[PDB]
């Protein structure tokens, strides 16, 4: 985190400032914070037929929510990088994180970590990168096979098949949602929300906070595009206190001939800090100072 | 040449107590009906301070009368180049001093209309906070006349009086006579070195900036004390009126009234002590003029280091600026 | 009535010294209205008005943003018992607009009103609900309508105990107290209400949780004849571009540079609107400064307006006691602003003429182009007022031209 | 110097509509208390028969 | 004077913030700490002058 | 100023303690009297600071008066403009109210 570039700064809501510098208390990342790096890979496909899912241990680990977190998305795009499952240099594309947030966690029938109880907030990107799903449902594991209701469970993941749902004929609105429905059953859904995302390779910033008014979703796509300032675009009516979140491992089922390189996104915790924000003439914050 | 700045004048500010405390609200004015004597006392104290300041400035500048000078030539009088201290209504060195000091311009003619038309300073905060900055007693064309007459007060033209002042300190007639050209060029380089003296690391320019910053700090404190909530739900009477009930409204408005009245009293005391200090400094400046400028002082250190020869005085943003030409062996 | 009457009233004396006094300025009245209100959607109160309300420990929260509601209907439905408010009043809520409105409602007996007071030590503030005072709040207890869609639950219930057992013998008792505005961990034992007065619940907490044994006890109060409810409302003011307004739009193009009263998307006040160059983020409708004051506004006609506070014309009064003649100085104001604009001053001032000097427009001073060395009424910038029938505007000028011949002692 | 009393038949259930910050119909169309003088509002029960 | 002005209560129940947090509820805690804050700020302003 | 500051209410119902004690209950009487006490103590502190500044200024001006007496009254002054205008012949001092 570099505060001199105003990285991860959430813009104030309902007002703007011009050509003045203010000190503010809010939820900002710490300067020089390395954060947590998450990489999404491509599944096993030896022949140009699909196979297993190549994921990491992101689903098993449970992270405290605290005051929220901010996500840096697609900062390594437009660059030559290696596919994770192999050693093939490819152009890095942008991938959107998938989240699972809740207020109580336990174990599955195996005894492995996970198993969010009662109403669980799901932030699943869809549309092959052009749609965001916000769901608030009770998560119920399905039995049989590798699903978490039978005693051989390994991990749960979200998969996409680009030669089926990323085609130019149309974009499957329910791709990652139907992939997620194969592991858990969605019951007693409080709300289902859909947000449209424009397809581009620009770097993005995503934030999420919580207070008495609900869960607030911030994105640099709204407002300061081609920038880093994050503006509020959604207020989910999630009034129970979120205590934990988990990054859902999202592995793409692509062939050997049509593999792709996907960026690594970074998650930084938010803290109740004081920041000196520098507002420009157009109102966007271009530099900041972390007083601590 | 050593440079000394002596302040003579601070900015004259009068505060409209009703507009400052209440910002034109009827409920606040009804509550301030019981505090009218304190507002009247604030206005009377500030008026008395400004009146005494004006009388001190008039007494300082009343030295033109009963005082005769002589006309001088153009920029070269004798072999001495005096175009820097002479008017072409300000001297070039006075203009150079004034351009290197950042002063927020108080519009005295039509500043209210300029601040009304302005879109994206404290001079425009004057009419929104309730205070008014009074214009100075004399137009700068009178201060320039005073400084020009003091330059004239050095029959007996300037080079002859300069050589007389050199003869008085212990240099004989022969040494002065054979080296008139060297003395003239050394005086010219000493005068030309004054361009680089308007810098923060010299003390006198720092004192000029300190006086300007003190006036700006007084105005800034008066403007920014209006944002104190004083324990109320908000620092604005409009928010109190829009958020509360009639019996609870008077408590918060009275808290704001008491805080702003106490702050006005503190401002009045600060203005009084600043005005007394400026009057004493103006007396010091008049004594310094009468000793160093109108004559030659035989006391070391009063009119600068070394042996005093001749002193020149010019106007300043809030006082007088002195150029003490001295003697130093090398 | 006129100038020098305000001077007499401020000095509280019929005799004052001759001089130039800065009298109080004038009162500014709004010359128009700038209303800009959208066509908002009705707020969804159907969850409150239909269905059984929950208990206090399982309260429902309703957050309203960018909507218009009808307060008279809601107040007519509910028979309101005592209410307590801290940073707001109910009349202020019914009068103005605010950025958000958060309502917490539940089924609550009227006999337990004291357990919701801020200093309460009972179990309601410990395990069921604690009011938060970060925002202006009201605490309302009311009786639900009888024959409408709101239905009575079976009884009133609340959490009487909520603690953690540890110490490898389940013998160490540590109570788990809730935070202001938050739920309880023990609310999952009976989310729909406890059935008996002495219901005892036990649950093993996981390793990611505290790790002890959760113990929860719930009490039950019999249901009264009429359904009594509690409401914990809250408001916010500067957090959103759109506002929530309880239940016409004008234009500022014909009135620019004049003091108007504005109500812009819920933000109300008074100010002067002028055309300005667009600064700040456009999607944030309002531009503020370091002191949280409105300095700009992005209108619906695609014009950024610079907002300035309403100003009063400064006033100074010249007075001469001997000749009883007085003059009026408008400090640093041009005479065209006195004549064309405003024209709201004192009675005789509204009715020699207006003269433009170096210190501003003056009335009551006749120009004579006369020169004096000094005087007792300086106006500033080498100007003066010399009494004669009436005062005359003069200026101060300098005059600059001795062998001892005759003795003279000064 | 003077004592001014306003009295009227009033139920004790509608007592909270007489509080100074109320938004009900009693403060709007029936009676609004004035705070220009030191005042007190008393709710009482009349003597029985 | 700077050290001894810290023992003034400015009308609060105590000159100690610890005592105020020990003895009072949050709506009165925020009201009684604010008197100490305003008094100490005013005393600091007088000291600065 | 010292006499007229006693008429300030400082937010109380009256500036008189006798009017407060005859109009209010003890838990509010203590609050109003504490308001008056705090206001009068702050005003007394401001008066004390003003008196200290005035007395230091008067002491410095008295030293200046002693220097002026020693320069102009007990001896003739050769300095220009220190004791009157023009040249100096003799000076006389008398007492003043302050
Ligand atoms: C990866 O490469 C793509 C190449 O298209 C980058 O997208 C381009 O980013 C530039 C950034 O300056 C955009 O230019 C801007 O365009 C707007 C609208 O025309 C204009 O108002 C701005 O002044 C600026 O010129 C450009 O439009 C955009 N193009 C597309 C197709 O998105 C992308 O930023 C690169 N990402 C990374 C992480 O390097
Ligand atoms: C933005 O703000 C800066 C600083 O506040 C402005 O820069 C000032 O401009 C004025 C007028 O040209 C100068 O007199 C000052 O010396 C400048 N100050 C500094 C620190 O540079 C700038 O003009 C503003 N830009 C706007 C309002 O568009
Ligand atoms: C808010 O609600 C009240 C009450 O439901 C509405 O007042 C009613 O209006 C209808 C139609 O004009 C009348 O027939 C009723 O007699 C009214 N009842 C009362 C008690 O006044 C009111 O119109 C609503 N406000 C708005 C803006 O629609
Ligand atoms: C009325 C209970 C018995 C009081 C007398 C007994 C002991 C006195 C000691 C402590 C009392 C502290 C609690 C005060 C009232 C709490 C009310 C509430 O929590 O809402
Ligand atoms: C009591 C019904 C409350 C229903 C919940 C919905 C909205 C409430 C929000 C704002 C209005 C505040 C009303 C305060 C109570 C009225 C008291 C009175 O007028 O005397
Ligand atoms: C942070 O950004 C500034 C300006 O963009 C840059 O000078 C600085 O080197 C950056 N910090 C680091 C650690 O690279
Ligand atoms: C998202 O796109 C669909 C398809 O065009 C459209 O119907 C919908 O209104 C869009 N959503 C928003 C919020 O604009
Ligand atoms: C006197 O100085 C000015 C600049 O300070 C210069 O332009 C002028 O030529 C000088 N006079 C002579 C006679 O050299
Ligand atoms: C939460 O879930 C647990 C088990 O999954 C259940 O016993 C409890 O009643 C639930 N709480 C609710 C629905 O409030
Ligand atoms: C959950 O699983 C972890 C890891 O095996 C274990 O440490 C913990 O005790 C388990 N908790 C429960 C409640 O089974
Ligand atoms: C206001 O200013 C904008 C930009 O300067 C201009 O386009 C517009 O025409 C102006 N409107 C008026 C009424 O002057
Ligand atoms: C007064 O009249 C003279 C001559 O008519 C003119 O030069 C001068 O500017 C006038 N003064 C004012 C203030 O108009």
Author numbering:
A (entry chain B): 51 to 98, 101 to 344
B (entry chain B): 786 to 873, 882 to 913, 918 to 951, 965 to 1140
C (entry chain A): 345 to 591, 596 to 699, 709 to 745, 751 to 763, 777 to 785
D (entry chain C): 443 to 491
E (entry chain C): 1031 to 1079
F (entry chain A): 1031 to 1128
Article excerpt on this structure:
Merbecoviruses from bats, pangolins, and hedgehogs pose significant zoonotic threats, with a limited understanding of receptor binding by their spike (S) proteins. Spike (S) protein is the major viral surface glycoprotein of MERS-CoV and forms homotrimers. For the MERS-CoV S-trimer, NTD is known to mediate cell adsorption by binding sialic acid, while RBD is known to bind the human dipeptidyl peptidase 4 (hDPP4) as the entry receptor. The S2 subunit mediates membrane fusion and exhibits a higher level of sequence conservation among CoVs.
In addition, S-trimer structures of six merbecoviruses from different animal species were determined. Different from previous MERS-CoV and MERSr-CoV PDF-2180 (31) S-trimer structures, densities that can be modeled as linoleic acids (LA) were identified in RBDs of most of the currently reported S-trimer structures, with CN-HedgehogCoV-locked-2 S-trimer being the only exception. Consequently, the identified fatty acid–bound 3-RBD “down” conformations for the merbecovirus S-trimers are also designated as locked conformations. In the characterized merbecovirus S-trimer structures, the putative LA carboxylate group interacts with a serine from a neighboring RBD via hydrogen bonds. All of these residues are conserved in GD-BatCoV, three in HKU25-BatCoV and Japan-BatCoV, two in EU-HedgehogCoV and SA-BatCoV, and one in CN-HedgehogCoV. Overall, based on structural and sequence analyses, the sialic acid–binding pockets in GD-BatCoV, HKU25-BatCoV, and Japan-BatCoV show considerable conservation compared to MERS-CoV. However, Loop-N2 in these S-proteins is incompletely resolved, suggesting that further investigation is needed to confirm their sialic acid–binding capacity. In the GD-BatCoV S-protomers, the binding pocket for this unidentified small-molecule consists of hydrophobic residues (I125GD, Y148GD, P149GD, F151GD, L175GD, L184GD, I249GD, F258GD, and F285GD) and charged residues (R273GD and K274GD). Further investigation is required to elucidate the identity and function of this small molecule.
